[PDB]
Structures are given as C-alpha cells and as structure tokens.
Design a protein around this ligand. Structure first.
Ligand SMILES: N[C@@H](Cc1cc(I)c(Oc2ccc(O)c(I)c2)c(I)c1)C(=O)O
Length: 366
C-alpha cells in the first residue's frame, strides 16, 4: 500500500510543479487576449506557508491537511477562470492556489516517511522521477488546449488535476502515532538547513537564464530545445539512482553525497560561460541535470535521518520556509547582473558560488 501513497505523492508533486513551471503559456495567452510577479508569488507561497503547514499537519494528520490544501488549490484555480480582473488573479491564483499547493505538498513529502524507513530514499526518488514526467508534460497539454479553448476553460481543465489530487490525498492513512522550536534544538538540523538555504539561492538560476544565454550567445544554433531535454533526460535519472544510493549510505554520511552534488552543481554552474562550443555545453548540461536530480531527491530522507519521523514534518516545513527567500531572490539577481555587466557570465558565476558555500557548510554537519 506504500506504492499507492507513492503514486499519490507523485501526482501531487507533478501536478503542482507542472502547473507552476508552465505559468508562462497561460499568461502569454492572457496578454494575447505586474503580470510577472504573480507567478513568482504563487511559486514562493508553496515555500513560505510550509512552516504554517507543518503545524496543521502535526495536528490534523497528513491526510486531512493534504485534502484541505488540495481543495483550496482547486477552489483558487477554478475561480481564477471566472475572474476578469488582474487584481483578482493575485488572490485566486496568487495566494489562494499558492497556499493550497503548499498545504497539499508538504504532507506529500511527510507521508512517505510513515511507510518507508529502509527504502525511503528509493520512494522519494521514484516520486521525484515520476513528478518530473508530469512537469515535462503540462507545458504541452496547455498548448494543445489553447488552440481549441480560451484561458478560462484552460483554468477549468487544470482544476481537475487538483480535484484528482484532493481525491488521492485520502490515501494518506497514518501509521505512525504549536510553534515547537524543539526542532531547532538540534544543531545538525540548523547547520543543514542553513547550507540548503544558501545553496537554494543559486539553485534556480540556470533553469531560468540558461535559455536566454543560449539564445543570446549561441545564435548559430536553432535547436536549443535539446538542452531542456538533456536536463530532463538526466535529472529524473539522477533522481532515481541517487534515491537508491541514498539508501546504501547509512546515517549522516548521506549528507556527503549531497555535498558531492553541490560542488558539482556549483562547478557546472560556472561552466556554461566557459563553453566555447555547443557539444561542451550539452555535456555540461548533462552533469547539471544529474546534480539537479541529486539535489532534489535526497532532501526529504535526510530530514528523517537527522530529526526522526516524529519531527520530520516540522523540519521539512521550516526547511522549505527558509528556502523560500533565496529561491525567489536568485533569478532576479541574475537578471540584475545581466543588465549591469552586459553578459550572463557573472550571473552564472554568482549562481555557482552559493552551491559551493552550501557544500562547505554541509561538509561539517556529519
Ligand atoms: N520541484 C521543482 C522545483 C522545486 C525544487 C525544490 I529543491 C523544492 O524543494 C524541495 C524538494 C523536495 C524535497 O524533498 C524538499 I525537503 C524540498 C521544491 I518544494 C520545488 C524542481 O524540480 O526543481
């Protein structure tokens, strides 16, 4: 019955981050029929509310919290269709759908620890790999829909994924039996969360500015899309094996194989500006995807390893809360160096440094 929960969490993570990762198409259509920050608000509200979501999880159960969050997300994403004013779309999709996604997603991570302890890394790896499949499908589905239906009906169609998520979150049967600062009482969690938050600043910069760099520098190449394939080809792969490998390494030594990611996640991050040809860029992006998958997958299992399963909910929620600010901050800062220095090179260097600082911080946790 654990794989039923794995399927439910896969649907959750995939739908939430496939609707968010495809936010450009719907709003491009809306312009065709200020606008930038509502998507950032929706994406960051998943992280900001996580400390709040942890308390509701601890009190009401993962099933109840996830079901309520998915219901709120469905309500927001559905009423976003009937809204004709942009101001109402800062609420219905911005804060309402955003908070719904946070309340739906934090229990999605927490529930996997109720069932798997020995193969928890494998379960999270499968969830992340399957979720990447959803994340690389929604961009297409909306572009099929737009050619036949308007944007409002597009929100209505996207709402049934939240409806199905609300139905599926009923499977979070709890086996294991309000501002608790007791999680911060552990120094290892503090240092680990600090390092993760530091790395998150430079984490999202490549997936935002890599396309712009390629279309600006490598103008002779028209088939740039293969790069997004390469990450998609490797990241999900990196999400699978790492999870399995996450089970082979016992205890806090697991953090080392996350540190190993960060350094490479940093190093390749400074290798895009150094690539004079295209094949080198593809090779670098392969390792970038692999390190992305490693960074994504190990996050939850290490929380259970450090703080246990009675406290993993608060640890995950607070970790996402601290992660919230750097993830939003990164790409805007990279755009600032882009505008100032005249190239993305300095942007990628400042994107690659924070992963290295995070690796240095995390190296001393074990
Ligand atoms: N999912 C998108 C964006 C994204 C990336 C990361 I790192 C996120 O933080 C996580 C992820 C898994 C965990 O177990 C924990 I604890 C925290 C989140 I929330 C979203 C991507 O593929 O990059």
């Amino acid at each position: 019955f654990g794989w039923v929960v794995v399927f439910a969490a896969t649907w959750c993570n995939g739908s939430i981050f496939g609707i968010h990762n495809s936010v450009g198409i719907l709003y491009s259509m809306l312009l065709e029929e200020q606008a930038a920050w509502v998507g950032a608000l929706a994406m960051g509200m998943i992280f900001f509310c996580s400390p709040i979501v942890s308390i509701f999880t601890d009190r009401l159960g993962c099933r109840i919290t996830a079901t309520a969050g998915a219901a709120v997300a469905f309500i927001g994403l559905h009423t976003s269709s009937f809204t004709s004013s942009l101001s109402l779309r800062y609420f219905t999709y911005g804060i309402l759908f955003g908070c719904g996604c946070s309340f739906a997603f934090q229990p999605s991570l927490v529930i996997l620890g109720h069932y798997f302890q020995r193969r928890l890394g494998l379960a999270n790896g499968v969830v992340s790999a399957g979720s990447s499949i959803f994340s690389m499908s929604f961009p297409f589905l909306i572009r099929m829909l737009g050619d036949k239906i308007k944007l409002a009906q597009t929100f209505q169609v996207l709402s049934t994924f939240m409806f199905v998520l609300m139905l599926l979150s009923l499977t979070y049967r709890p086996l294991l039996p309000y501002f608790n600062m007791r999680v911060f009482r552990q120094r290892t969690y503090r240092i680990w969360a600090f390092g993760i938050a530091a790395a998150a600043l430079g984490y999202f910069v490549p997936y935002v500015h890599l396309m712009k760099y390629v279309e600006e520098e490598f103008s002779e190449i028209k088939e740039t899309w293969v790069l997004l394939v390469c990450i998609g080809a490797t990241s999900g792969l990196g999400r699978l094996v790492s999870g399995h490998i996450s089970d082979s390494i016992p205890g806090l030594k697991k953090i080392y194989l996350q540190v190993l990611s960060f350094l490479l996640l940093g190093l390749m991050s400074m290798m895009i500006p150094l690539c004079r040809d295209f094949g080198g860029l593809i090779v670098v992006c392969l390792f970038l995807g692999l390190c992305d998958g490693f960074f994504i997958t190990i996050m939850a299992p290490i929380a259970f390893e450090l703080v246990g399963p009675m406290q993993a909910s608060q640890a995950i929620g607070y970790l996402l809360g601290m992660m919230a600010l750097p993830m939003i901050a990164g790409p805007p800062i990279a755009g600032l160096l882009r505008n100032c220095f005249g190239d993305y090179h300095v942007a990628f260097y400042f994107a690659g440094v924070p992963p290295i600082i995070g690796a240095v911080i995390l190296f001393f946790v074990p």
